[PDB]
Every structure is written in C-alpha cells, then in structure tokens.
Amino acid sequence: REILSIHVGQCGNQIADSFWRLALREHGLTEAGTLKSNMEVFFHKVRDGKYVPRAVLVDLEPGVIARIEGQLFDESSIVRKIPGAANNWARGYNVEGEKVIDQIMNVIDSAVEKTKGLQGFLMTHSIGGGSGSGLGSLILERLRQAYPKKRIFTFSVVPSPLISDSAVEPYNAILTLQRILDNADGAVLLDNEALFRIAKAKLNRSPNYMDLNNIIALIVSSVTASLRFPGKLNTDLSEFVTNLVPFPGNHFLTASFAPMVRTNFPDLARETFAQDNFTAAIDWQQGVYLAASALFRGDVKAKDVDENMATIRKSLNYASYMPASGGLKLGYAETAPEGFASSGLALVNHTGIAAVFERLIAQFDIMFDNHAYTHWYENAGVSRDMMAKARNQIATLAQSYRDAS
Amino acid sequence: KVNNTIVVSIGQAGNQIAASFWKTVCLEHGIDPLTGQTAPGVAPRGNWSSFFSKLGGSYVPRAIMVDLEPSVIDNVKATSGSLFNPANLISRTEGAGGNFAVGYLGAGREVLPEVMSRLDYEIDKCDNVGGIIVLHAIGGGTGSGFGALLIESLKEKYGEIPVLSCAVLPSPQVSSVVTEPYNTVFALNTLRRSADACLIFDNEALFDLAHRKWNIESPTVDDLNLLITEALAGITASMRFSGFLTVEISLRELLTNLVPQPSLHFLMCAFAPLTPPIEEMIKSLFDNGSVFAACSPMEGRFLSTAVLYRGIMEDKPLADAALAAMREKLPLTYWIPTAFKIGYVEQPGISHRKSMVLLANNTEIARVLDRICHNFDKLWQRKAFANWYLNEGMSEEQINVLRASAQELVQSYQ
Ligand SMILES: Nc1nc2c(ncn2[C@@H]2O[C@H](COP(=O)(O)CP(=O)(O)OP(=O)(O)O)[C@@H](O)[C@H]2O)c(=O)[nH]1
Ligand SMILES: Nc1nc2c(ncn2[C@@H]2O[C@H](COP(=O)(O)CP(=O)(O)OP(=O)(O)O)[C@@H](O)[C@H]2O)c(=O)[nH]1
C-alpha cells in the first residue's frame, strides 16, 4: 500500500503538477503541503504538516521543473539534469540516459528501501517526447528487471491525431510503448484532443494544457481512489492487474471521468460511460470493451450504482467472452473530488485503443520505409533493427486487441 | 456451557458482514458492539458462550478476521472498536485482487500459519465446539482463495467439526469483479469437498428486498449486510438462546436436519416480516422474493426447511395449523417427509417484536450457481484473465478439475 510516482518529460511533469495540485486538497492540504482515508500511499511522512509526495521529477532539459518549484516537492529526489533531451528516444536512453540512470535508480531504490510495503509504480509521461519517452523506457527497463514482483502503471499521453508537436514523435511513441509492454502490467493512455473537447464541454471558454492535465489528474486520482479512500468494495492495483488485463500483454487502458455538482446519479453514471467522455480518442463503433472498471465515489448509493444497468445493457458493447451482466469491476469510495457530490471513473480495457496504436503505426509505416529520421537514432546508438522489432511487438499487441474483439 | 461456534470471516464482504453480524448479536445480548464490554447491571441474554468468550473480563466474540489488504480490516476496526481481539485480526498488504490463486498458493500460504495459530488458540478456549461459520464472498479473490485454503486445512487436520459457510454470490444484475466466475467456481469446489454446509446470499436480491419492502429509495450495501445480519441472527438464535418453550439447535443438529446427503449442503435463507420497525406474515416468510438470493424458489423444490420463529407465541396451535396448511402448497421433496424443523426462540430480534427466519435447502440454488457456471463458460472458452492464475501457482488441468467438480455439484442437485 505505497506508491512511487515517476515523472519523466515536460508533459509528464505538468501531469504531475496538476495531479498533486488536486491530490493535496483532496486530502485537505495546500499545494505547498500544509494541513488545512489512508493518504500515506502517495505521500511519505516528513513533517506533521508537510506530507511529501515522493515523486521523481527527472527530466532532461529541465526548464519547467523550475516553475514546478514555485508547490514544494522533495528537492533531493528530483534532478534538473544537464539539458540536451531533443526529441530523440536514444538520447534519453543511451546518450544521456546512461549518465542519469545510475543516479535516478539510486534515488528510486533509496525511496523504496524506506517503504513498509509497496504495491507498484504510477508513471506519468508522454510517449511522443524524447526525455519522457526514452528516459521513461530506460526507467521501465531497469525497474521491471529490479522489481519484477511490483506493478508499474504508466499514464502516458499519446500524441494527438489532428496535429503534432514533435516531428519524430511516432518513433518515440512506438519505441516507448514496446518498453511499456515489456516492463509494465498496466497502462492508461491519454489523448490530447479528447481532453480539449472534454474541457470545452466542461467550461465555457478556451482551455489549455493545464485544464487537460487537471482532467488527467482527476483520472489518476480516481484510479487509486478506492485504494486511498477505503469505503465499501475496495480496489487495489493488484486487483486492477488481475481483472483488467485478460491476457499477459494486454494492459492498456482508456479512462473517463464524470461529471464534466449535485447531479442526479443516473445521469452521472450514464455520462461516465459515455463514448464521447473518455480521455483517449479510441475506436468505439467497431471496438468493444474487454474489462470496464466503474469506480464511483462520494455521495454514491450502492443500489444507485447497481441499478444503472441501462447504460451497460444499452450502450456498452462487450466482447463475446464476457458475460452480459459482467465486465464490471465495481468500486465504492466515500470521498469524491470537491465540486462533485458523487463522481465516477470508467477505466476500460478496450479494443479501440489499438486504433490509437495503429495511427502511430501508420506514421511509422511511412517513415521507416523512407529512412525519414532514423539517422538521429543510428548516430545515437539505436539501430533500425530494434526500431523494427519494437514496431513488430506493437503491431502484434494491436492485433491481439483486434483478435480480442 | 453450550456448543460453541467460531465465525472466521475472510475478504471484504465477509469482514463487513461479520462486523454488522456481531454488532446486532451484541446488541441482542445487550452488549455494546463498539466497545466489546457488557452493559453494567444487565446480564447477557441467552447462551453467550456459544459465540463469545469471557476474556480476562470482556464478552469478546470468537471471530477470526483475515484479509490480504489492510483497508477492510482497518475499516472494521474503526466501526467496531476493541470488540475483536487484535491478535485474531490478521492483515497483509498486496491483497489478492480477485485472484483465487493468491489466497490459495501464494500470499495465502504464508498468511495461513498465523491464521490457524489464532484459530486453534480460539478453539482450545472452546468448551465443546460443534461448528465453524466461514463468512466470505466467493466472488472475490482473498475470500475465495483463503476460504479454500482454510477450510481444506481444517478438514484435513480436524474433520469432526461441522463447517457452515456463508458466501456472497455475484449478482446477476451486475458483477463486481470480472474474475468472480473463476473465484466462485474455484471456492465452490472446496465448499463441496471441505465445508459440511454453506449459506448463500446475493446483493441485488437484498437491494429489491430493502428498496420497496424497507421504504428506502436506494439502500446501500450497509442495509444489505444488515439484512444478512438479521438472517444470521435469526439462524444462530437457535444456538444462542435456551429455555423451556424454546428448543436448542446446535449447528451439528441444524446440519443433520438440513443436510440429508453429503453433497446437498448449500442453503437459502429468508426473513420475515418485511416491514420497517400470523398468516400474512406466514406468507411474507415464504414469498417468492423474500429469499436472500436472486431466484424464485417456489418453482424449485425445498429439500428441508428450518423455520426458526423468535418472539411471543400467543397462537401456537393456530400457527402450527398455518404451517401445516402452507406445507400443502409448497414444493417439498418426497424422500424426506420430516422436512420442517420448527425451531423456537422466546426472545425475538431487536428490530421486531416477533420474527421468523427461513433456512432452506432447495434445488433452485443450483441453477443460480449454473448461471455463475455459465459465466465461467465465457471466461474459459477464450482463456481470459487466467495468466495470473497460472503464474501464481494454479494449472490448466487444475482449473478444469475444479470446474468439473462444480458441474458435479450442480448435477448432484438435479
Ligand atoms: N494532453 C497534454 N499534453 C501535453 C501536456 N504537456 C505537453 N503535452 C504534449 O505532449 C506531447 C509531447 O510531450 P513532451 O514533449 O512534453 C515529453 P518530453 O518533455 O519528454 O519531450 P523533450 O523534453 O523534448 O524530450 C506534446 O504535444 C506536448 O504539447 C499536457 O499537460 N497535457
Ligand atoms: N452484503 C454485502 N455484500 C458485500 C459487501 N462488501 C462487498 N460485498 C459484495 O462482495 C462481492 C465482492 O466480493 P469482495 O471483493 O468484497 C471479497 P474479497 O475482499 O476477498 O476480494 P479481493 O479483495 O479482490 O481479494 C460484491 O458483490 C460486493 O457487492 C458488504 O459489506 N455487504
């Protein structure tokens, strides 16, 4: 019952920013850690008012970590590394990754050596970067091989379909998703344009990344809500692995939070499992649900949760191997985020997230055949053969989803 | 001194139902549940030694609680205070998480020796133990796995002590874990093999029983565990109260009157009256929906029914005639004519001045398990969620054997 959070990259670090901005007052503390329901799973005991979130903000070209420290973290565990991230996965893996992995894993095993008992890791990053992609992949590699009995969860922002912020980001995405496969037993994928449209629906003016990462932060908070807010029908990360991962390598999740508030519970539950409310733009029409976890929290009523079966027997489409009334991991938590009397999270193992994967595949299917940006990898130590086999693994995973329909 | 009964609770549903169970039992005996000490100037009503013990002193319950995650045990401690012995409370961290194999071969194996150290410590303090009640949900992982390991090692090392199980089944309205079919079938095998008897609950049945028939627009699981608690209090009142007109019924005698054949030992239960705090009440006990399971038992076939009344009895010949009249229009098996055990308790429950509990053996429960087995036909035709069962220690052939044993039970019913 302890969480070590890993934050690599600018996107992952802003996700972490918003994540603790809401997690601190979700337990009644300010952003700086001052006191204004076992909340010690995320936080280490340092001072009676300062409950320190032990999360490593390791990131090449730090830049943003300065504005992170301006909300107080543990300054010893985090590092503002010498810059030079670029958007190269190999540059975060073996060029400058090899000169930071010893220090970051010394920090990590010092953080977990003082742990009474650990459940796993929740890493927030973006697969499309160069720091959060390559450094995250290296951390996954040397963290699975160090603690094979622990359960790494990755909250990765997949690059947007409509427009791109990096010109080599599908290379990075695929060659980090391969490491997420080979090194983690759980993954929640985030898509940016879905977050933009959700925040457009939620608010009345134009949002930005801070609102998107607030939504992502609500997602991550409700992921572990049943673990740190013990009510009835508790949920654990081991339970997430057991009942959301039907096959050994199929552990990529799409997440929706509701509402977007003294709302009527049927509306909250039917809008929680809404095809347009999920935070990753995945394939719903042709896709089906493998394993949906409904984690409701706050002013939730057990009969209300269990009687909202209209949205499951009407809107939710399941695979052939799951029972019609099954496919639900139900969870109750006594505490919901503020502004919500009762709120809900849908964590779905779904076929349509493979569509997410395949769009990166599509980009890789046009770049590798044209020798597009591969010299940036070859001169950095990552050859074309390992990129090809990483894409082969990712395509096999997407085909596993397509076969699991 | 009277025959003893140790209630070991495993898993979240088992531990919370047990918390409510000894809450209501203590307030039936006049004992404060949140403290564990008797009320000053008030003697414990009935045979306290059957389910409790004078620990010097306090009227402590003889309850063993184990859960592979700390949250449920901590919640039970917060809602119950110093009622239970902290030594009898055993907790782990990582949990089982819907995985039977964790509680069977894994963390369950390493947590087992301390659990039975506390168990045989408790049973050595018993005068003449004649039953052990295992309160759990077989839908979950910790509940199923450690209920299996615990009852199996009991029946291999003991075996003269009857075992009554009280397992919460998955609701056909909604599942709470997607591996509930796995856990339920895996623990159902050992309930058949090891446990001498089993009691079955179902959540959404209690929901519809507590929504319109309790006047709450949306009851929580607290009211469901409260209904199960009323059921258990009525059932164990035969083991808890003595006197002239009332009859004492041990869990072994209840076993004998409820279990004609070794494999026919899964029980249904119902409670009456269905009103917030006689012939209409007689039919209220035996309504098609009054049972605490999602089925209609009146198209099934009652093997044997223990009808335990508790409260004032002003019309005992008229009520016996009412039971005789109702027996004509109820589905009873021809091979046991003495299928009605009419148990009496002078002291009623706290909620009602007079109440009855039905504890029946019916064939319909099999079709209930069959739909769970039907759910097992979905997760096993595709080999889904079974990687971690293999990784923790179970096998393809072992799972096939366990499912075949569950089917053997279902076909033994019909
Ligand atoms: N949905 C969100 N996307 C974000 C957020 N922050 C950044 N991004 C986007 O993620 C995508 C790539 O993430 P990053 O480049 O920041 C990951 P990293 O810092 O490791 O890249 P480099 O430092 O250049 O190596 C890009 O579209 C960013 O604009 C955010 O808070 N939410
Ligand atoms: N009548 C009650 N039913 C409950 C209660 N708590 C849970 N349940 C029911 O139990 C069923 C699920 O079983 P659990 O997960 O609680 C048992 P366990 O903790 O051992 O599972 P794992 O933690 O995954 O190992 C589900 O239908 C719940 O609605 C309760 O307090 N009362």
Author numbering:
A (entry chain B): 2 to 37, 46 to 78, 80, 84 to 273, 282 to 426
B (entry chain A): 2 to 57, 62 to 282, 292 to 428
Paper text:
We thus used a different system of reduced complexity: bacterial tubulin A/B (BtubAB). Prosthecobacter dejongeii BtubAB heterodimers form four-stranded (4pf) mini-MTs, which exhibit dynamic instability and treadmilling. We designed a mutant of BtubAB, intended to decouple longitudinal polymerization from lateral assembly interactions by introducing multiple mutations into the M-loop because lateral interactions are exclusively via the “MT” M-loop of BtubA. We termed this mutant BtubA*B (BtubA*: R284G, K286D, and F287G). Right: Single protofilament/1pf polymers formed by BtubA*B M-loop mutant (BtubA*: R284G, K286D, and F287G). Using cryo-EM, we resolved a 3.5-Å reconstruction of single protofilaments of BtubA*B protein polymerized with GMPCPP. Comparison of the 1pf model built into the reconstructed density with the previously determined 4pf mini-MT wild-type (WT) structure revealed that the 1pf and 4pf polymer structures were essentially identical. Our explorations of simpler-than-MT tubulin systems therefore appeared to confirm the straightforward conclusion that the conformation changes seen within eukaryotic tubulin heterodimers upon polymerization are not determined by the multistranded nature of MTs. Using three different systems also strengthened the case that the within-subunit conformation changes are shared between diverse tubulin superfamily members.
Many protein filaments function through dynamic cycles of assembly and disassembly, characteristically using energy released through inbuilt nucleotide hydrolysis activity to perform work by pushing and pulling other molecules around. These dynamic filaments have been termed cytomotive, to distinguish them among the wider class of cytoskeletal filaments that perform organizing functions (itself a subset of all filament-forming proteins). So far, we know of only two protein families that form cytomotive filaments and have inbuilt nucleotide hydrolysis activity—the actin and tubulin superfamilies. Overall, however, the picture is clear: The tubulin superfamily, much like the actin superfamily, appears to have a shared subunit conformational switch upon polymerization.
